[PDB]
Design a protein around this ligand. Structure first.
Ligand SMILES: [Mn+2]
Ligand SMILES: [Mn+2]
Ligand SMILES: [Mn+2]
Length: 301
DNA sequence: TTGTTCTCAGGTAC
DNA sequence: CTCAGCCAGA
DNA sequence: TCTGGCTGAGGTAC
DNA sequence: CTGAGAACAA
């Protein structure tokens, strides 16, 4: 029974809350006693270009494996005993998926007894229902009804870095604008996205951080922070703990520090725009229009 | 001239 | 993200 | 009859 | 997730 470091668990709870899954399934299975088999699985999903992160997870947790599904990969942990040991330690730090973890533990503990009685089995299946209801469930087919065809500041920053590495965004932008001396306005943004159903979580962010705002559009919400001074301070505290977006955070800090110098010279303004390009290059950028090359059309002004 | 607020939306990476 | 599923081994 | 390794995909929530 | 851009506020 491996005992995990708290700082590792704190960051991982954040990352799990963002991009991880705690899943309970009822597999139809003829060779099983009650014609169904229970499956409990912990997943962390991540783009394959970042599978080193998931490979590190296997080493750190000490069990489980990584699979590759084309463009995306997953760390997977299914083995019941290590799964129980792991989730028991992760769950005090989970914020969004804590109940799921607790229910999966409850299930694992009643497994022996749930395999000896149809009554017990069915009840355990309703707990699976509860986990699926807590999850962002979409394509669930087999339910328990189907079965009823039986006959401190640092701690906050570690967690937050995990959530940021998973569901957050560190954004640098060059926005075209005639009124600006160099016809462009630099823009820096820290963002955390979450479906509006869960904006209570983003509301907490505003409180614990002290600055920033929550915005809604369609059915998703963002926590955003754009003010240069608070952003510099915030990202200075955060970046030691980031693993996926640390380089972006440092580039944003380096940009902020050079804003004075950038706003006086045309060659330094361009140079800073190339730092913006670098951030976008590190991000999973898809719809970028204005690059530094665009700004290089300053060869008129 | 600049910083910032506020909302929307493309294309995946969950 | 969160399901769906098959197969080999004991 | 049970378990764990392994594969494929629908529909958003990033 | 990570862009876009119109408009308010200095
Ligand atoms: Mn998420
Ligand atoms: Mn992510
Ligand atoms: Mn995500």
């Amino acid at each position: 029974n491996t005992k995990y470091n708290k700082e590792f668990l704190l960051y991982l709870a954040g990352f799990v809350d963002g991009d991880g899954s705690i899943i309970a399934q009822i597999n139809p299975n003829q060779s099983s006693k009650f014609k169904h088999r229970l499956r409990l699985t912990f997943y962390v999903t991540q783009k394959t270009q970042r599978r080193w992160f998931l490979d590190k997870l296997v080493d750190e947790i000490g069990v489980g494996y990584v699979r590759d599904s084309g463009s995306v990969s997953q760390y997977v942990l299914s083995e019941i005993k290590p799964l129980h040991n792991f989730l028991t330690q992760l769950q005090p730090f989970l914020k969004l998926k804590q109940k799921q973890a607790n229910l999966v533990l409850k299930i694992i503990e009643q497994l022996p007894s749930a395999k000896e009685s149809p009554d017990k089995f069915l009840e355990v299946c309703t707990w699976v229902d509860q986990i699926a209801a807590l999850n962002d469930s979409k394509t669930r087919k087999t339910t328990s009804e189907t079965v009823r065809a039986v006959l401190s500041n640092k701690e906050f920053l570690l967690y937050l870095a995990g959530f940021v590495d998973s569901d957050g965004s560190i954004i640098a932008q060059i926005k075209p604008r005639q009124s600006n001396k160099f016809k462009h306005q630099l823009s820096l943004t820290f963002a955390v996205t979450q479906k509006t159903q869960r904006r209570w979580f983003l509301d907490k962010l505003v409180d614990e951080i002290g600055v920033g705002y929550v915005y809604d559009s369609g059915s998703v919400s963002d926590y955003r922070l754009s003010e240069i001074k608070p952003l510099h301070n915030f990202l200075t505290q955060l970046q030691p703990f980031l693993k996926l977006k640390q380089k972006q955070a440092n580039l944003v800090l380096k940009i902020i520090e050079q804003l004075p110098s950038a706003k006086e010279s045309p060659d330094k303004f361009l140079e800073v725009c190339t730092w913006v390009d670098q951030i976008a290059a590190l991000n999973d950028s898809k719809t970028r229009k204005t690059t530094s090359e665009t700004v290089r059309a300053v060869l008129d002004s």
